[PDB]
Every structure is written in C-alpha cells, then in structure tokens.
Design an enzyme around this catalytic site. Structure first.
Site, PDB file in Angstrom:
ATOM      1  N   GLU A  88      82.110  81.053 -24.554  1.00 59.57           N
ATOM      2  CA  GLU A  88      81.368  81.342 -25.773  1.00 59.57           C
ATOM      3  C   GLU A  88      81.620  80.211 -26.763  1.00 59.57           C
ATOM      4  O   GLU A  88      82.772  79.823 -26.982  1.00 59.57           O
ATOM      5  CB  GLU A  88      81.793  82.693 -26.358  1.00 59.57           C
ATOM      6  CG  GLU A  88      81.432  83.880 -25.468  1.00 59.57           C
ATOM      7  CD  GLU A  88      82.162  85.152 -25.845  1.00 59.57           C
ATOM      8  OE1 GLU A  88      82.686  85.232 -26.979  1.00 59.57           O
ATOM      9  OE2 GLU A  88      82.222  86.076 -25.002  1.00 59.57           O
ATOM     10  N   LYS A  99      86.917  85.182 -16.443  1.00 61.04           N
ATOM     11  CA  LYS A  99      85.467  85.016 -16.362  1.00 61.04           C
ATOM     12  C   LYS A  99      85.056  83.548 -16.379  1.00 61.04           C
ATOM     13  O   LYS A  99      83.984  83.198 -15.871  1.00 61.04           O
ATOM     14  CB  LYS A  99      84.785  85.761 -17.516  1.00 61.04           C
ATOM     15  CG  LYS A  99      84.883  87.286 -17.442  1.00 61.04           C
ATOM     16  CD  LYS A  99      84.465  87.933 -18.743  1.00 61.04           C
ATOM     17  CE  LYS A  99      84.335  89.451 -18.612  1.00 61.04           C
ATOM     18  NZ  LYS A  99      85.576  90.120 -18.133  1.00 61.04           N
ATOM     19  N   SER A 133      90.192  88.564 -19.308  1.00 62.70           N
ATOM     20  CA  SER A 133      88.790  88.172 -19.197  1.00 62.70           C
ATOM     21  C   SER A 133      88.593  86.664 -19.335  1.00 62.70           C
ATOM     22  O   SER A 133      87.512  86.210 -19.205  1.00 62.70           O
ATOM     23  CB  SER A 133      87.951  88.890 -20.248  1.00 62.70           C
ATOM     24  OG  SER A 133      87.979  90.259 -19.957  1.00 62.70           O
ATOM     25  N   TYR A 169      78.712  93.171 -23.583  1.00 62.72           N
ATOM     26  CA  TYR A 169      79.870  92.699 -22.835  1.00 62.72           C
ATOM     27  C   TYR A 169      80.214  93.671 -21.715  1.00 62.72           C
ATOM     28  O   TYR A 169      80.400  94.869 -21.953  1.00 62.72           O
ATOM     29  CB  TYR A 169      81.051  92.542 -23.796  1.00 62.72           C
ATOM     30  CG  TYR A 169      82.209  91.721 -23.276  1.00 62.72           C
ATOM     31  CD1 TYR A 169      82.035  90.401 -22.889  1.00 62.72           C
ATOM     32  CD2 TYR A 169      83.490  92.260 -23.212  1.00 62.72           C
ATOM     33  CE1 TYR A 169      83.107  89.642 -22.425  1.00 62.72           C
ATOM     34  CE2 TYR A 169      84.562  91.512 -22.760  1.00 62.72           C
ATOM     35  CZ  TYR A 169      84.369  90.207 -22.372  1.00 62.72           C
ATOM     36  OH  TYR A 169      85.437  89.467 -21.923  1.00 62.72           O
ATOM     37  N   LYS A 206      87.352  81.534 -25.241  1.00 61.94           N
ATOM     38  CA  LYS A 206      87.236  82.808 -24.548  1.00 61.94           C
ATOM     39  C   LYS A 206      88.519  83.591 -24.767  1.00 61.94           C
ATOM     40  O   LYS A 206      89.615  83.045 -24.607  1.00 61.94           O
ATOM     41  CB  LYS A 206      86.979  82.624 -23.048  1.00 61.94           C
ATOM     42  CG  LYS A 206      86.749  83.946 -22.306  1.00 61.94           C
ATOM     43  CD  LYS A 206      85.417  84.588 -22.696  1.00 61.94           C
ATOM     44  CE  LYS A 206      85.325  86.037 -22.258  1.00 61.94           C
ATOM     45  NZ  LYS A 206      86.121  86.937 -23.117  1.00 61.94           N
ATOM     46  N   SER A 224      92.184  90.106 -22.615  1.00 64.72           N
ATOM     47  CA  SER A 224      93.051  91.230 -22.952  1.00 64.72           C
ATOM     48  C   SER A 224      93.194  92.155 -21.750  1.00 64.72           C
ATOM     49  O   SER A 224      92.196  92.580 -21.166  1.00 64.72           O
ATOM     50  CB  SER A 224      92.494  92.021 -24.151  1.00 64.72           C
ATOM     51  OG  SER A 224      92.280  91.187 -25.282  1.00 64.72           O
TER      52      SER A 224
HETATM   53  B1  LIG Z   1      88.409  91.166 -20.850  1.00 68.14           B
HETATM   54  O1  LIG Z   1      89.755  90.947 -20.989  1.00 68.14           O
HETATM   55  O2  LIG Z   1      87.776  90.912 -22.034  1.00 68.14           O
HETATM   56  C1  LIG Z   1      87.962  91.955 -23.043  1.00 68.14           C
HETATM   57  C2  LIG Z   1      88.334  91.661 -24.355  1.00 68.14           C
HETATM   58  C3  LIG Z   1      88.535  90.211 -24.791  1.00 68.14           C
HETATM   59  O3  LIG Z   1      87.634  89.352 -24.586  1.00 68.14           O
HETATM   60  O4  LIG Z   1      89.598  89.867 -25.362  1.00 68.14           O
HETATM   61  C4  LIG Z   1      88.512  92.700 -25.273  1.00 68.14           C
HETATM   62  C5  LIG Z   1      88.317  94.037 -24.875  1.00 68.14           C
HETATM   63  C6  LIG Z   1      87.951  94.326 -23.556  1.00 68.14           C
HETATM   64  C7  LIG Z   1      87.772  93.284 -22.650  1.00 68.14           C
HETATM   65  C8  LIG Z   1      87.377  93.523 -21.177  1.00 68.14           C
HETATM   66  C9  LIG Z   1      88.163  92.611 -20.268  1.00 68.14           C
HETATM   67  N1  LIG Z   1      89.481  93.274 -20.027  1.00 68.14           N
HETATM   68  C10 LIG Z   1      89.619  94.406 -19.119  1.00 68.14           C
HETATM   69  O5  LIG Z   1      88.676  94.819 -18.538  1.00 68.14           O
HETATM   70  C11 LIG Z   1      90.996  95.047 -18.925  1.00 68.14           C
HETATM   71  C12 LIG Z   1      90.927  96.520 -19.316  1.00 68.14           C
HETATM   72  C13 LIG Z   1      92.274  97.214 -19.111  1.00 68.14           C
HETATM   73  C14 LIG Z   1      92.792  97.050 -17.681  1.00 68.14           C
HETATM   74  C15 LIG Z   1      92.802  95.590 -17.233  1.00 68.14           C
HETATM   75  C16 LIG Z   1      91.470  94.877 -17.485  1.00 68.14           C
END
Ligand SMILES: *[B@@]1([O])OC2=C(C([O])=O)[C]=[C][C]=C2[C][C]1[N]C(=O)[C]1[C][C][C][C][C]1
Length: 358
Positions: free
Chosen positions: A270, A64, A61, A148, A313, A316
C-alpha cells in the site's frame, strides 16, 4: 554517526515500547545500501531470551507482500494474467461466481465483499476451502468496493501456485526464499530454529503463537527476522540486485491500481505520497481500513509506485505486530518487528519519528 542514529531510533522506539508494554522489539534500517539493526527487550519474558536481529517474529499480513512476489513471478513467466477469471486456474470453481471475478479483484480485495477471515467452520482443508468459495455470493459488484480480506488475496496466492504447478508452501520454501537470499525466513519453523522463535504476548501476557488455518501461508504465515526481512526490503529497493526473473517479479508488485483516500493499492503493498502528515499515514493504516468497506477510485492505468512515495504494509497476529516501509526516491528502508500486537498507529509513529529528517 552510527551512535547518532542509535540515539534517534532509541528515542523513537523506547517511549512507544514502554507506552504499549512491548516485551521485545527489533528495528532494521537500510540507508544508502548500508544495514543497521537495533534490538530492544526480550523475545521471551520467561526464559529471559533477548531480542537480536536474528530473532524470528511472526510478520502476519506482511506475508501478503511475499505472496504477491510469488504471484509476480507467475505473471512474469506468463503463467497467468491479472485480468484472468479466477475459475480459470481452479476448475473446481467453475460454475461459481468466480467465473466473473478477476485475479486483480482478488489480489486487491475488490472481488465483491469477501470477508476478513474464513468462517470458523472452514478448516485447513482443500475441500472445505473449495466448498466455501463455491457457495459464496457477492455483497457488491466486483472492482467497486475494497474490503480487506484473507480469503481474497489468499485465493489469489493459491491460484498463483496452481498456475505454476506446485503447492504454495513448497514454492515459497524452495524457490522464493532461496531466490531472495532469505535463510532465516520460514513458513514452517524448523525444529533446529525454534530457539530463535520469539514468544508472543497479548491480553494478560498470555503466550500466543499462530496456529494453522485455511490459506494461512498465503495470508499471514511468514516468520522471519529483522535482518532477513530487511534483505527483502532492500530487494524491493533494488530489484536489479537479483536475477532477471525475480527482479521482474518484484517490480510487478510495485504497480498501483486504485486509490482510497491517500492510499494507493498495489499488489500487497500500500502506497502513499511522500512527504505526508503522520495523522494521514496513521489513518491509512487504521482499523477501519481493515474492517470496513470503502469505495475505490480506479486509476486510468497501472501507476508505477516509484519516486517520492512511501510503500508500506502492516502485519498483526494474536501475539505479534510488524510494520514494513520503504521509500524508493530516498533509498531508505525500515523494518519494525515486535512480539506484541500493539496499535498500528503506534507502529507508524515509530517509523515516522525515525524517517523525520533523514
Ligand atoms: B493481517 O495481519 O493483516 C491485518 C491487520 C494489519 O494489516 O495490521 C490488522 C487486522 C487484521 C489483519 C488480518 C491479517 N492477520 C490475521 O489474519 C491474523 C488473525 C489472528 C490469527 C493469525 C492471523
């Protein structure tokens, strides 16, 4: 000096790596415009490949922030405006609730309860993505609750590409990444580069690389190296180092719009006041902030995220865990890329330990 900083980073990273069983990790640090890289562990436990500053990690993410830079470009070229209704840039959405949802609401996760992920029945197909939004009903009123959401800011990126007249993936490959000087940054890793593509590990060390999904490019698609991602961080610390159009596109993302606790929400980024305790910075990046809704406190006007602040930021995937942060007033940038999805609190712990002092 370079040996003292290596001892600091090594004292910050090494205990957390063993404590979370992280096979490989890369740190890239920018201080006073000088690059520094630190590599630890293995990109592949099987073939013994070692991590290097050129190793490609899934940044999740953190993508983003790139998507936001794309949207920032559209805003600066006057192809869209943050108060534009969403359905203005996608006629298929007209007649749906997105006639009364602004792009800002989408960029900042305050559209009215768009969930974290697309439903599993929604595949990487425009018509299914279209149908989903067309039937979506809000849980809340727009601009009141932050939840989120990949569909939220994913749609934001998708509409930015539309306003520019080309697909989102193509615009990133052929304009954004070249304009930012990123040659080791990909949405689709070329076959010639796969050898640098680190392996990801999760529960039971089962190998995990990200697969396709609706609006994956916009939400969590970028793969890059610590060095190339530090180039991007430096570009955020010094937008003037780029051509005028892309300097203004990066400055666009350095604008805060509302607060939740200690966190000020910008476009992708953020922000937090600096200095601030580790527990508070950890609390701002904790799981509840990703999975649970929160009421917002809108700022009377867009607030510039410059000076004694910490923009960051997390990122994951199922097999990777990244964290990016920089401090404008200190001219310091940090990149922590790992091939295990380990707790954000631990990512912040490494970054905080390094930042402590200078
Ligand atoms: B994204 O990575 O942000 C995120 C986080 C973070 O900010 O660390 C924590 C928990 C969920 C998310 C959603 C985003 N990641 C995904 O959508 C990811 C899900 C598993 C498959 C690949 C994409």
């Amino acid at each position: 000096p370079a040996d003292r900083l290596k001892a600091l980073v090594d004292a910050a990273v090494q205990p957390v790596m063993k404590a979370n069983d992280i096979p490989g990790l890369a740190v890239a640090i920018s201080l006073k415009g000088e690059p520094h890289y630190f590599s630890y562990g293995l990109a592949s436990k099987e073939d013994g490949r070692r991590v290097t500053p050129e190793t490609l990690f899934e940044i999740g993410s953190v993508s983003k922030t790139f998507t936001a830079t794309l949207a920032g470009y559209a805003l600066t070229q006057d192809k869209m405006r943050l108060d534009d209704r969403a359905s203005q840039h996608w006629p298929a959405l007209q007649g749906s609730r997105f006639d009364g949802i602004s792009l800002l609401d989408l960029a900042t996760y305050t559209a009215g309860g768009l969930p974290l992920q697309f439903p599993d029945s929604v595949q990487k197909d425009q018509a299914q993505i279209r149908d989903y939004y067309r039937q979506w009903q809000p849980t809340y009123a727009p601009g009141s609750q932050r939840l989120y959401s990949n569909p939220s800011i994913g749609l934001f990126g998708y509409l930015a590409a539309r306003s520019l007249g080309q697909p989102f993936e193509r615009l990133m490959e052929q304009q954004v990444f070249p304009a930012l000087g990123l040659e080791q940054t990909h949405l689709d890793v070329p076959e010639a580069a796969l050898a640098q593509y680190a392996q990801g590990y999760g529960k039971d060390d089962r190998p995990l690389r990200v697969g396709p999904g609706p609006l994956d490019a916009e939400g969590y698609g970028v793969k890059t190296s610590a060095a190339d991602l530090l180039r991007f961080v430096d570009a955020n610390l010094h937008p003037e180092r780029l051509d005028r159009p892309w300097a203004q596109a990066l400055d666009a993302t350095h604008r805060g719009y509302y607060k939740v606790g200690d966190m000020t929400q910008g476009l992708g980024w953020e922000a937090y006041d600096w200095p601030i305790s580790l527990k508070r910075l950890q609390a701002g990046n904790s799981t509840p902030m990703a999975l649970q809704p929160h009421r917002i406190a809108r700022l009377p006007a867009p607030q510039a995220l410059e000076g004694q602040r910490l923009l960051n930021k997390t990122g994951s995937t199922n097999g990777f865990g990244a964290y990016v942060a920089f401090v404008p007033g200190r001219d310091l940038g940090l990149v922590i890329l790992a091939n295990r999805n380990y707790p954000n609190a631990e990512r912040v712990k490494i970054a905080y330990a390094i930042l402590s002092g200078l």
